[PDB]
Each structure stands twice: as structure tokens, then as C-alpha cells.
Symmetry: D3
Subunit: 308 residues, 6 copies
Amino acid sequence: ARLAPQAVLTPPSAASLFLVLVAGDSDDDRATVCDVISGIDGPLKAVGFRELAGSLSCVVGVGAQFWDRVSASSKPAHLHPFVPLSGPVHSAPSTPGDLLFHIKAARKDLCFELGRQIVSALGSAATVVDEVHGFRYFDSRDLLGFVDGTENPTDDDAADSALIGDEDPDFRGGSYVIVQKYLHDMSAWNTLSTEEQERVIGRTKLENVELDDDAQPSNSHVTLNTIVDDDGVEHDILRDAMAFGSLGEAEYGTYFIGYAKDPAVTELMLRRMFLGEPPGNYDRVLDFSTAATGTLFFVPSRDVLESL
Amino acid sequence: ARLAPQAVLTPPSAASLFLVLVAGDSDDDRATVCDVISGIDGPLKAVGFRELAGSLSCVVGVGAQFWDRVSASSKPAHLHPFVPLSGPVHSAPSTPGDLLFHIKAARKDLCFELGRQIVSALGSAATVVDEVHGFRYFDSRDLLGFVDGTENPTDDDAADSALIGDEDPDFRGGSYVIVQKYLHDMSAWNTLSTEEQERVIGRTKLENVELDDDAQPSNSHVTLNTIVDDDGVEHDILRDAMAFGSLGEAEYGTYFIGYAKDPAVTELMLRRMFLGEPPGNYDRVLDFSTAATGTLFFVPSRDVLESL
Amino acid sequence: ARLAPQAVLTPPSAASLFLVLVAGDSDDDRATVCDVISGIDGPLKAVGFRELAGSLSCVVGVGAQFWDRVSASSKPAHLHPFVPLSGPVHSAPSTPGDLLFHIKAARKDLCFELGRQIVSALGSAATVVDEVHGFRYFDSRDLLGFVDGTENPTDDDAADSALIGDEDPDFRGGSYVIVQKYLHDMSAWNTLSTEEQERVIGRTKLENVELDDDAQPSNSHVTLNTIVDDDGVEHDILRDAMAFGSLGEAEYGTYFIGYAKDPAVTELMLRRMFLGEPPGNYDRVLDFSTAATGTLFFVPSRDVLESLG
Amino acid sequence: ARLAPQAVLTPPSAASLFLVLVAGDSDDDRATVCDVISGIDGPLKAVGFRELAGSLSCVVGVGAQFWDRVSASSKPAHLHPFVPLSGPVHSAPSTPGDLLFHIKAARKDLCFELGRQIVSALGSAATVVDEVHGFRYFDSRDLLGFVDGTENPTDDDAADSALIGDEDPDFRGGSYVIVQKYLHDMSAWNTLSTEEQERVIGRTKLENVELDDDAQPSNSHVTLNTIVDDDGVEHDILRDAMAFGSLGEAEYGTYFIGYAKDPAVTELMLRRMFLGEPPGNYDRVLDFSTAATGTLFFVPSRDVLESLG
Amino acid sequence: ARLAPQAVLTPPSAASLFLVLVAGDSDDDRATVCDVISGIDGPLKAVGFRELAGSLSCVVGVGAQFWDRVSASSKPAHLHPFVPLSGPVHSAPSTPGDLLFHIKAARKDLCFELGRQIVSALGSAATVVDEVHGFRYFDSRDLLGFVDGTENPTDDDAADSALIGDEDPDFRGGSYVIVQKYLHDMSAWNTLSTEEQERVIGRTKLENVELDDDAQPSNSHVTLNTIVDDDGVEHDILRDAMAFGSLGEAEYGTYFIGYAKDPAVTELMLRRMFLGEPPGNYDRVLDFSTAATGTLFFVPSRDVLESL
Amino acid sequence: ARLAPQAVLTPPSAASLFLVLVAGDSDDDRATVCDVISGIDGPLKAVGFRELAGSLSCVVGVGAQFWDRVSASSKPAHLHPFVPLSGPVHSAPSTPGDLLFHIKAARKDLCFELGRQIVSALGSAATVVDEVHGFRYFDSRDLLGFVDGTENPTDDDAADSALIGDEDPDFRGGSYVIVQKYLHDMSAWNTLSTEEQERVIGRTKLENVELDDDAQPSNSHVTLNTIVDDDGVEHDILRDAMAFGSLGEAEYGTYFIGYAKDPAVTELMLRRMFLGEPPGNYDRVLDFSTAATGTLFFVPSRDVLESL
Ligand code: HEM
Ligand code: HEM
Ligand code: HEM
Ligand code: HEM
Ligand SMILES: [Cl-]
Ligand SMILES: [Cl-]
Ligand SMILES: [Cl-]
Ligand SMILES: [Cl-]
Ligand SMILES: [Cl-]
Ligand SMILES: [Cl-]
Ligand SMILES: [Mn+2]
Ligand SMILES: [Mn+2]
Ligand SMILES: [Mn+2]
Ligand SMILES: [Mn+2]
Ligand SMILES: [Mn+2]
Ligand SMILES: [Mn+2]
């Protein structure tokens, strides 16, 4: 899908930019934001066409509250604000955001320039409340040192997992996305042996092979994030996480971003991670990772976005 | 996508070859021509398969007159010779062409070699009347210094704009292509300021951003080439323009090529450009650009081309 | 089709790995094999996701005999062992194989690592009986010096040629694949002039242009592998042959692998090549190429493979 | 110069990292710093060798004050703190820094990982006071939209411009580097027409062609940064500026970094830019660019750096 | 190596531009020409710096006659006009040229743009008399189908063969370059068998292996272009030939360009080729190739070029 | 150093080929081998020139015995056969080899083709006794999972470490190389924890960081292979090791190849590894790696090779 907005199914990229904004209260602010997001193909092409490979993509997400301001009388089935989670040891906050721009390209300059044109076009109508410049780290790893994304669904599976279908026909082709900015405690993480780390994640570290059933702990990240319904059907989400950080501020992060046709799947993963399954048996990744943000967005299809 | 002829929807390439030929009057000439074009998959693969990436593509177009020699009692709805235009200041001529080969690849040698094999196979049955070796110029620019092709429809929009559909079902998947070889007056263009050049085109020069609605002249290239019908529906074409040139002959060119499911769209753009809207309010691009050729071809689907 | 098993339609790659294995006789062995092949997407991603381009692919084939052990009451319409052929001077032997892994990637390490993980997961439940590390050779040439793959069908034609459709709906999207490891007699081939080599193949050597009708021999590789039925309809196969060899053993080979929605097409090509058309007018490529293996496998669709056992 | 520290002459890269740190006051702190910088080839290889192209490089600079703590009785001829400048409306401040790491690579992860390992090895012995992640912007442009670096000297001229030679033999192959982090006023710059911007810089914008003599303003960036001595000899510096920024903070910057065998050249350029020539005829780039830092460092040769302590 | 003019030793490139110009008779013309060529580093960097890889190079050559206008009382030892040759069957003409720009890059646009800027800077002071856009053809082949440039000296050998040394110390680091634009008779060449073609060249065609000593004809291109002196010392030249062509004009060409520290080597090769060794035993390449131009230039070192 | 034989200092490559041969006993065999190796630039260019990047290199090594047959009266200072080592637990055999070809390129086909032409040109005059097709494994790792080559000397250090200098002036520019084909016990290796493995090697596994002094065991691979003279000067070697293997034969290998201007440095490393320092404290890498071959070759400079 070349230089088309709302391309949820794009493969991983070398660079990304995650912009979360809050819209101003006026109707003028509302109208500027609407103009910009609905014509987002304009700047996407203005920047993206300059690269022969045409790698640049831009997914626009709209928060529950803001959606109500621009489409009061027509709403996707599962749009609501992000549900805060308060677990026995760790919590996932719900933090502000009216707009998400999830931008990816083969090159940092293309991300940066697209962001520059979007922010400039929004002017005073919106404020950036979170900004993360994601980068690929070695062979698709996160800063914990593990290959991150391995089990993503691909092709038809990706589309079945992430894209709204017959269950909500007026919003077919759309999706729901959750973001969380995580910061890691690297020194604590490095006190663990590699084997302890593998038991936390659920895969071997260098080789990125899922641990055997009989060595797979019940609170591993993989176990807690495997969602199987009563008919034995697995329900997957599409993740585009990227590393980020700042060396001077000792910040080493993983920007989580996950797409699903029904956000309850993602929400259940989060509940199982933060509260545990069974309750108390929580994800030991959270012993080394703290979420600074937590926001849910509806991702309209191109058609719906273009007519807002 | 790989190594199939009539692939109208291919993204922009580093190199291009445009060959326009006239066929011989005789029945033997018609027969050779018909053999070469209906078996064009042969040379396409003979050349294209030698490159791992398989970037080589070849679109064959057939003029109205030659189409009648070769497919007498079956014709696409809108196939007719290129309509010449005689405007208040500038004119677009209608020049000969029975065959078009629009060849693209990541490399020049691939273009040249495919060209060489097509020209050799045709032998005395056909004569090259126009030959242009197109090249990508910096970040997708034309020799006027502007990013050229930015607003092209992509994905579904590209297929809806370029490819014949339900409306003419015997020729579904075909297209109509117009070419015009433009020569620029570089020294005249260079006497304009960047800002005046921007007013002529409709977009900022370095940054490739569409001028604000309030700043957009009504005779800008962008305005005159925007086609909106009575119902408020926009109609687009798919362009694959490339730069070409000769330093010794001081020739600096843009080779225009545009595909549409209905040439009425392309032709209306050309009228607005050359005649003006309102009349005499013509495209100031034409003050620095002169069309040396002008030819319309029908682009059969792969299936229709192969049975001929 | 990014990192999905059974991607029969993937374009040519720089590196490939062909693994042919025989499964152990026990119920335990069969169960381990079933587990590995129906979970093949696991190692595929474990390895493939580490490369940004996601070039890695893996096609699993299952032999007729093994298929009956693991899906006794549901079988694609044309699954049978490779049919051997014997001409007077050249033969196409039928050699063992229950499992095929046809692995492709932009890089050798990716093919090797995926092979390593698969072999490791199978452990004592299967034995490697053939292993070939294929490599792209110049501009898509085989070791005879000819561009090899030129006329492969692409896109819709590739899908129409290779994949089971309405004729056998329970296995739609599957395919039948035949492999033959050919070893070349390089010094005999080198005694021919270029023009003689071109008459053997049916295309010019450097330029890879098909010889025109009047110049195309009735026993050229191209002529005998052209299949036009009574109704005048052409039937194609999808090939992904690669060069392989060992300098010290003097082995210079072409690993033939051809996919078809119905192996009758591939089998008729082989009959024409080895037995000739008219009878005895065989394919002279076989004067310089000797098949050391010959095996047929059913390639199930993803859904069918994942459901196994 | 593959994976060797102090490679001042490396060509432009897609990504860079500029780290400026202040060393702790203790003997322990100094010793840890000494250990890390004189062993810098260790982390350089640990990270860089993982990339086949070996694009990663790392130049270590040491401030005048820190230098005296760790090599009290041997000092290059021109090592002194950055000399601040104050014009009537624009100033070049002198800001803290004992250590510079100027890291470049084809990829961001390589710069980041090397920075991570260096910061980690220094631990509490040094503090990061400036950190900039530079990136190539289109066709070698800065965020003002101009090609930035065009006239850099190359090969022998680069070596002649940047590296200490016979004038100071104990430090042959070293250099002096100045950094300034500039932030731009983008909306003010955008109020200029292209032609006005070109008169500010001294070259055409899209085409990056130097304005001819009759059209070149006496206060253009190019004119004021052209240094021709009394004898008519030109003196150049080697620059490796990169774009950087933050959209939410509205920070759009150029990180200036310039190497010279004698910082007098760079210092005279800065005087001309900030104070003007003739006096008051300053560089109008400064109307749109404000320096937030200003620091000078000695870049020792490999041999000198490795020998430290 | 990067972006410095007069880089004779650069490896082969994907694209090339050969510009040969004659200068105006006047003193103003001489002055402009002298300004452009002595400041050629300017345009080289203006263009070349825009490409991260910095592949762009430009070698300036000056003909004997123009050199005398511009450096009257100081001349390299072997600078004289191209010596025409009149052999038993084939002839090599001596055509005009004051200036040569031999431009190479990984991309055509870089070549074209540098060319455009040089031609513009020269304005009316000089006229393009020959222009050739060279391109790499498959695996380093010429349009005769043979790998072209195989035996080129590399590294120290390339410097010893091409660059003026101790023997003429005022011009150290300079070179002498000969160009000839050859046009092929493709249909005649194609009537030879591969084996006969191999006998003509001196090497196997696909495999690019030198024929066995016993199988190597004495009139092969390889034999006639091997120069061994009395002492048994071989003398080599550095060639940078490129294919060029026009399909409509049926022009298939090899642009020959050869650098030597002493043109006596190149000239002897040309005599052996055109006159034969023994006399009349000439290069059978010349039966399928006709030289349309022939010009000799001195290539000053960077230092000598810049003070002029 | 482009397409030049005996390029010892080339950086790591994606592919390599290691060919070890024994020459036949006749004087005819001796003469054929001499012809081939001394003209090795012929096939190097015949194959290498076909790749634009020109990555192909070929280093020829000559064994002690064979050298005596072709240069009986002139010998480099340290040429002798490989010294077998018999340690408390492991041994390094000395195995046959008259010729080494160490071939590297960006592509397997270039290695293979060069090898093909060499073996063909040697015909019956020599027999291949060992053949290994090396490949790059992920981010420069060996099959033990560790980055392999990290501490290689580079630039001036590489030349000082590997190339014969003033100490043996008649062979300046040459080198000495040792090869050992190692096969690993992967199952035994994988019983170790990552931390145990790191203590065996002397560096962290994923991060490839040398262990601290106080955690660096005295029998680690790194400790045993660090060679410091009595003046505190370290003596380094240049290694080009590559992974190889065969999945059907359960072969997972590391082909060791190491260059030094004085092979005593390499030999001392081997003694310390196999016998231990102090005696008995041997390299625990050898508990998981067995050397199947062991051969020493002299690497002549280009000049010396070309005049054999
Ligand atoms: C001298 C020849 C021409 C030049 C140099 C030229 C240049 C450009 C440029 C720079 C743009 C803006 C970027 C973009 O592609 O969106 C553009 C847009 C366009 N041009 Fe042209 N053009 C030429 C001829 C033509 C002709 C002959 C037609 C129609 C028959 C045409 C149709 C268009 C259209 C439809 C657009 C998109 C406008 C929009 O919807 O925003 N152009 N052209
Ligand atoms: C020694 C092993 C073989 C070699 C070296 C070889 C080589 C080639 C070459 C050079 C071509 C022409 C370029 C192309 O279109 O691919 C070709 C075509 C072909 N080969 Fe093979 N081949 C081999 C074995 C086989 C076998 C066993 C089959 C069938 C079972 C086969 C089926 C084909 C087909 C169908 C074509 C396409 C012919 C056409 O429709 O134009 N080949 N082969
Ligand atoms: C806001 C920060 C700056 C920006 C945006 C900037 C931009 C540029 C640009 C666009 C050029 C022309 C292309 C080129 O040759 O590089 C240039 C040239 C140059 N700049 Fe800067 N510059 C900055 C700061 C500095 C500083 C602080 C110095 C000196 C200390 C400097 C020294 C130079 C030099 C020496 C040249 C080469 C001029 C010539 O010889 O033609 N620049 N700069
Ligand atoms: C029609 C124009 C020409 C063509 C098509 C052509 C083609 C070739 C070919 C295919 C080779 C063998 C591969 C290699 O480069 O080593 C070659 C070699 C060579 N050519 Fe040319 N050539 C042409 C004109 C010239 C001219 C005019 C000269 C000298 C003035 C020349 C000098 C050489 C030399 C010195 C060699 C290397 C021979 C050796 O030492 O092995 N060529 N040429
Ligand atoms: Cl960004
Ligand atoms: Cl072309
Ligand atoms: Cl493999
Ligand atoms: Cl960084
Ligand atoms: Cl050009
Ligand atoms: Cl190999
Ligand atoms: Mn799972
Ligand atoms: Mn529009
Ligand atoms: Mn056919
Ligand atoms: Mn200047
Ligand atoms: Mn020779
Ligand atoms: Mn060490």
C-alpha cells in the first residue's frame, strides 16, 4: 500500500515517529484538526513521494472524546478511553491523547519531515503531549536484548487480527490501537542471568526460539499474552514496537503500539500482564518496565478518515 | 506484479524508455507487428528475468488507426487519435504513432536491452518516430526543479482512475495513455523568482507543499489540472513523467505520460491547460514548455493484448 | 506473503536450501514430525523476523506414503510416489523422501539457521537423505551458462499453474512439487560450441532469446517442455531451480524443483524429455545432466498444513 | 580507516551522535575517564564489528582544563577553552565540556549502542551535559533547506586543513574541534523569500551553486567564512554538521562541529560571523540561528590518546 | 578519493558522461574557459555532495592547441594533437576537441546535472562538439557482448601505467587521455558465431577467459593491444569504456577512453590495431567498429589544473 | 586494493571459499601449478571484473615443502610445516597442503566461479584435499553464537601485525597464514549456560563486550590468545574466520584462518590454547571444537608471486 494513509498492515521499518496530541477546546481548533487529519494524504505524499522506494506511512488514530466532537452521531462499536489498570505491584496509567500519528519509513528524515508538516499545519489547534523517535535495534531487538515482534500475525492473519470486518460494517477497514511508552530499569534487568530473562519473556534470547511447553513459566510474557477462546481459537494482535531513548537522561525505552479489530483482545492481554493470570501471577517484564503513558485510539479506514 | 506486460500501475522507476513507432502499410508488416506485441511477454522475460529484483516492465499502447487494422470489429469505447489543441498563445500538436512501448526498470541497461530486442524483432515492419530515455532527477523532480508526480493516485485510487472497469467490460483492465514530449526554455524559467515559479506550478518548490487555498492562483498548473464534476467528484489520472535531455543540443525536457480509464479526463485537463479556464486563463507552465509530440494510445489488458 | 509457510509463489532468491528427509517408522516419530511441520510457522518467524526485509520462506512438502500415515482418510486427488522413467541411455530414478523443506532467502545464514532449527526440532524422528545449498549464479544462470527460469509464469498465471483450485476443493491452494538433483558433465558440455548448446536448450546463450520457429529443434529442451493440450491450451509449471556444487568432488549441479496444480503436467514434461516426442526424440540436456534423485511431494495450503494431527 | 578511533577524516554519515560530558572532580573519576578514553577502541570494535560495512566511527575530544589533569607536562600548542564572543545582538557562549564523543554510522542503533556502552563504562565519573542525535536530511541539507557541507576540503586538502603537522610534532595527526548547538527560528526564516535566503547563505538554495562575485554579498555566510591570509593563502576547516530536533518542543537545529589543525582559523571565522567584517557587518544566518553551546576540544591522534595515563 | 577533480584512477561506474568541447577564438572565451576548468572543484562539489556515497567524479582534459593558449611557456612532454591513422582497410580520424569532461557517478542525474552546470558556466565561450551518455551494460559488458575492461591495471599498476611520474616532474600526477567514439555494425557482428567472435576479441565470451596461448590469433584484439618492450616489460593503459546507443537511429556504440602516462603506448596500440602487426594483420574488431571521433587531451594534476 | 592478488588486509565478507590442494610429484605438475599461481591475477580479474563493486579477492598461500620445489635458493625467514600439538586433553594435527586459496567476495557465485576456474586450470597437476564454503552468520557471529573477529587489528595495526617488513626485506609485503578447520559439538556447547560460555570465550555473548579484568578467567580464549612481550608490547594476528556446515552430516564448523608477519605469534597462541598457560590451563573452547586440519602457508607478495 504505497503512500496511502491508514496503512495498518505495513511491515517493520528502520525508523518511526509516534506523535500524541491533545486538540484545543474551540470549534475553530476542532475544524483545523478535522481539516488536517482528513486531508492527511496531502502531506504524506508531499514528503513520501520524494523517496523512490515510497516507504513512508502514516496511520492517524482518534481518541474517544475527540471522536465525539467530530462524529457525534456515528461511532465504531468499541471506541472508549484507555482503561487504567491497578495491579498488585504495577499499574498502567490512562493518559491524555486526542490524536495519534504513527509514522514509519526507511529513513529518519522522512518521518521527521512528515511530522514537521503535520505539526506546522495543526498550529495552535493542537499540542504535542508525547513524542517518541523509534529506531530499529540490531536484528529486530528491543533494548531488553530480545527479538521483538517475532510472532506478529502476517498477511491474511494480520488483516483478520487487526482490521474491522463484518462485525461493525460502517467502520470496515478501520482498527483500534493502544500505545504505552515504557521505560526500563536496565541495571536491574542486567542483574538477571540470560536464562532468568528468557523465563521472563518466554523465548531464548539470542536465538529467539519459544521455550518448550514444559519449560515455559505460567507468568512468562508469552504465556500471559496468548489469548485462546473457549473454542480453542487464538486471538492475535499486530504490534509495531520500537526502541527509543536518551543517554544523558538514562532513558532506555520500548514504545509499545498494538493494533486489533477488537481492543478487548489487547485489553485482556494488559489485564493478564498487570493483574496476573491467575490474579497475582503478573508479567515479570513489568518488574523492569514502567509505562509512562496509556492511550486508546480508533483508526478510521481511509474512506472514513477522508470524510470526517 | 513481476515481469507481466501492461502493468500500468507500477510505481516510479530510476530509468525509463519511451518508444513510439509507426507501422508499415502492408499486410506482412501488420502481421509482424501483431506477432511482436501479442508475444511481448517473451522479450520482457528474456531481459527482465536476468535481474534478481525483477523491476523491468513494459506497457504496450496501440494507436486508434493501427488498432482498426488488427482488431477490426471490436474497439474500446474511447479510442480515437490525439485531439490537437490550438489555444490563444500555445498549441499542442497531434503527431503520428501506431505503437507505444513504455518501458521502466531500476537500471538503464535493462530498458535499453528490452528496447533493442523489440526494435530488432519488428525489423522493417515499423519505424521509430520518437525515442526518449527518461531518468529520475534527484528526489523525484523534473528539470524545472519541482517534485513531479506527487499527487498521483495510489493503490485502489490508482486502479479506479487508470483502468477500464464495468463501464466497458470487453476491455476491463485496459487504459488510455497520452504522451507529449515537452522541451523547456530553461533560461526563461530561470529568470523567474522561486516564488513566481511556485505560483506557476501550484506548490512550494523545495518542500513540495500545495499552496494555501487563498494563495493558489486560478491559472496554476495544479488548479487547471484539478478535475471536479457536477456532483463534486474528483477525477484523476496516473502520470509517469520523466526528465530527459541533451546538453550539446540544449534540450531540457519533461516527457509527459498519463493513463486514465477515460481519456475525456486527460483531454479536459489539456483543454484547461492550453485554452484556459476561463478562456485565455491558460497554464503558465506552457510559457516555458513546448509540446513537440502528442499521441493517444489504447493500452489493452494483458489478456486482450495476447489474443490479437 | 511475508514470513508465511507454504508460499509457493515467492520470486527467485539469492540463496536456497533443499532438505529431503525420511521419517522414522514409529508412532512417536510420526507424532514429532506432525508437530514440527504443522507448527512450521514458529521457526520460520523465529529466524525470518530477524531480517528487516523478511525475505525468508519455507515450503513444506509431504510424500504420498507419509501422508497416509498422518491423514489416512483425506488425500489430495493426485498424490502418488514419483513415477520413475527409463529411456535407453537416461533414467529418472524414484528416490526416497517423506518430507521436503524448500527454503529461500536473500542470505545464506537465514536458510542455514532455519534448516538448523528444523533439523534440531525433528531430532531422531527423521533423517536427512538429501541436502542441497543452492545459490544464484550471475544473472540468474544455471552452471550450463544459460538463464534458467525465464519463462516461468508470473502473478495470476503462476497461481493458475501451480495451485490447486476448483478441481479439488478440499485442498485448494496446495500444490504438487517434484525435485530432481541433476549433476552435469561439464567437460562434455564444454566440447559443444555455443550454437550447439543453444540448439540443445532452445534459446540463445548470452541473450536468453528463444530461437525462432524455423530454427527451433523438435528435441530442444524448450520444445519438449512445451505442453499444449488437444484443445490448444498451454499448461505451465513453476520452477525454482538453483545451481549447487563442490569443486573438490567435481560436482556441478542444477537442483530442479517444479510446482504444478496437477503433477500430470510435470510428469508429461518428464516423459517427453526422457522418452522423447516422437518416441526416441529425447532431450539432449540429458546427455549432459544425470538425475541422482527423483521425489514427489504434496504441498498443503497453510490451513491444511497447520491442521495436520 | 576501518573501526579506528580518532578518524577525523571520515566522510558524511546518515546518523551521528554528539555527546559532551563533564568529568567528576576526584582522582578516581579522572582515572576512570582516562581508562575509558584511552581504551576507546574496545567499545568501538565491540559495536562496530557487528556491521559488515564497518561504518561506525568515534572521535574523542578532550577540553583544555581536563587535559591539564591528565597530561600536565605535555600539551598541544593551541589548546585553550572556547573563546566566547558577544556582538550587539548575537553571542557565542562558552559552555562546559571536558569530553566530546563525536560518533558517526550508517545506522542509528550503532551510534546509540556505542554511546550506551561509553556512558555505561564512565558511570559516575562523568555527566552528560549535551546530547544530540544528528540525522542526514534529504540530499545533505540542513533544516534551513540548504545543502550543508558542500565546500568541505577532501582527501589531501582535508588532511592539510584538519590535522596537526610539522608545526607541533609531538601531536602530529591530532586536531582541534569546536562544537556549537544552534537552534533555528523557522517561522522567521520562512518569512524570507528563497532569493533572500540565498543572499544570507551565499549559494542558490535548490541547486547549491555559489552566487557569482557581483551577486555575492559581503556579509553572506560564505564570504565571512572564507579565510584568505596576507600571502593570499586560503585556510579551510572540516565540518560535519547535522540536523537535529524535537517537534513537540519546536526545536529545529543544526549541530555545528568543525575540525582544524589550528583553532585560530575556526576562531577567526567565528569573529567574522559574530562581529562582522568590516566591523558590524555580521553573518545574517545568526538572525535565524542562536548558539546554545560553545566548546573547544583537542582531538589527540590514536597514539597519543591510547598512551593517556 | 571523494569529490576531487582529476581522479583518473576511479573504479568503473554505472553511468558516465563524455563531453568534448571546442573553445572560442577570443581572449574573453579563453578567460571564461580558464575560470571554469581551474575552479571545476566548485561544480563537482555543488553536485556531488548531494549524494551520500559521493560517487561523482570529473576528469578535465585539455587539448594541445588550447593548452598553448593558456599555459604558453610550460608544457608536458608528450602533449600533441591526436595522430590520425590510415590503415589498409580501416581509418582512425583526428577530430576537434579543446576540452574533455569525463564524468562518472553511480547515477545518471548526477552526471547530467554536473554536465548541465559546466555547460551553463561556459556559456558562449565553448561549444559541445561530442556528447556521449555511457551506461554499464549487464556484467561490465560492451554492446558486442564481451566483458569490457577486464585486464585493466589496478592499484599500484594503475598508478604506474596512467600517471606521469619522475620522468616529467613538473606534471607529476597528470595523464594523457585518448577518446574514440566507436559505432558498431551489429547485424554484421551477429552473423559471426560465438567462436569466431572469441577469435576476434581474444577471450571467451560468456566466461571472459583469455584464450590459450596456442589458440590465440595473432591478429586478436588482445594480442594486438599487448605491448611488450625490448626488455620484456609490459606497458598498460587504463580504460574506462562505456556502452551508448540510440535505438531509432540504430546506433550501438562503445565509447573508448584510455589513460596512459605516455601516449606513445596508446598510439602504438592504435597502430597495431589499424595498421596491423605484421602490416595488414589488423584488428578484426575494426571490421565491426568504426571510429567517429579521435582526440587526445592532457589531464593535469589537480594542482596544475587549479593554477591556470 | 581492487582485484589484486595477495590482498591480505581485506575487510570481512559475506562469503568466502577456502581451498587446500596438494601438488603432483612430476616436474610437469610443478610447472603447471607455478604457471597458475603466478598468473593468478588472470582468473581473479576474469571473474572479479564482472561485479561492479569489485569485491572479489584471492590470497595464494604456498606450503614449506612445495616452496622448496619452486624457489629452492630463496626462502622467507619463517617458512616451515605446521607444528602438530599434543596437549593434555586436545591435539592440533598437522595435515597436508601445498597450496591455499583464500577467496572472499560479497557473493557466493563469485567465490565459486573463481574456484571453478582455478581448479580447472590446475587440472591433474593438483588435488583438492580440503574445501570449505564460508558464510557470514548474522551480525558477524560464529556458530557458537559469539561475534567472531571483534578485536582484529585494523589499518596500520593490521599491516604491522600481518605484513612482512624490514625484518625480512626480500619478502616484504608477504605474510604467513595458518588454517584449521574446526567442528563443534553443538549439543555439549548448548548444555552450558550463557554465562559459562562467556567465561569460556572471555566476552559477553549478545553484547560482545570484553569481560572485566576481575571476571576474566585465566584460561578464557581471550586471555590465552593475548600475546604480550617482555617490553609490554602486544602482538596481534589478523583473522578471517567464517562459519560453515552441513545439516545432514550434523557438521557445524568454524574455519579458522590467521595471518601474521611472524607465525611464531600465531604458533604461541595455539600452544597456549592447546597446552595451556600455565601448562594444563588450556582453552575451554577446545572442549567443544575439534580441529580436523592444521596447515601453515607462506603468502608471497604480489611481486614475488608473479615471478615464481
Ligand atoms: C511541461 C510538462 C509538465 C510539467 C513540467 C508538469 C509538472 C507538474 C508538477 C511539478 C506537478 C505538481 C506535483 C504533482 O505531480 O502532483 C504536476 C501536477 C500535475 N500535472 Fe503536470 N506537468 C506537466 C504536464 C502535464 C500535463 C500535460 C498534464 C495533463 C494532461 C498534467 C497533469 C498534472 C496533474 C493532473 C497534476 C496533479 C494536480 C493535482 O491534482 O494536484 N501535467 N505537474
Ligand atoms: C538439468 C536440469 C535442467 C536444466 C539445466 C534446465 C535448464 C532450462 C533452461 C536453461 C530453460 C530456458 C529458460 C527458462 O525458460 O527457464 C529451461 C526451460 C524449462 N525447463 Fe528446464 N532444465 C532442467 C530440468 C528440467 C526439468 C526436469 C523439467 C520438467 C520436469 C524442466 C522444465 C522446463 C520448462 C517447463 C521450461 C520452460 C520452457 C518453455 O515453456 O519455454 N526443466 N530449462
Ligand atoms: C547555524 C549554523 C550554521 C549553518 C546553518 C551553516 C550553513 C552553511 C551552509 C548552508 C554552507 C554552504 C554549503 C557548504 O559549503 O557547506 C556553509 C558553509 C560554510 N560554513 Fe556554515 N553554517 C553554520 C555555522 C557555521 C559556523 C559556526 C562556522 C564557522 C565556525 C561555519 C563555517 C562554514 C564554512 C567555513 C563554510 C564554507 C564556506 C566556503 O568556503 O565556501 N558555519 N554553512
Ligand atoms: C570498438 C572499440 C573497442 C572494443 C569493443 C574493445 C573491447 C575490448 C574487449 C572486449 C577487451 C577484453 C577484456 C579486457 O578489457 O581486458 C579489450 C581489451 C583491451 N582493449 Fe579494447 N576495445 C576497443 C577499442 C580499444 C582501443 C581503441 C584500444 C587501444 C587504443 C584498446 C585497448 C585494449 C587493451 C589494452 C586491452 C587489454 C588487452 C590485454 O592486455 O589483455 N581497445 N577490449
Ligand atoms: Cl522523527
Ligand atoms: Cl534506454
Ligand atoms: Cl544453507
Ligand atoms: Cl544515537
Ligand atoms: Cl548524462
Ligand atoms: Cl564457493
Ligand atoms: Mn504461540
Ligand atoms: Mn488536490
Ligand atoms: Mn512458449
Ligand atoms: Mn571558495
Ligand atoms: Mn596479458
Ligand atoms: Mn585485549
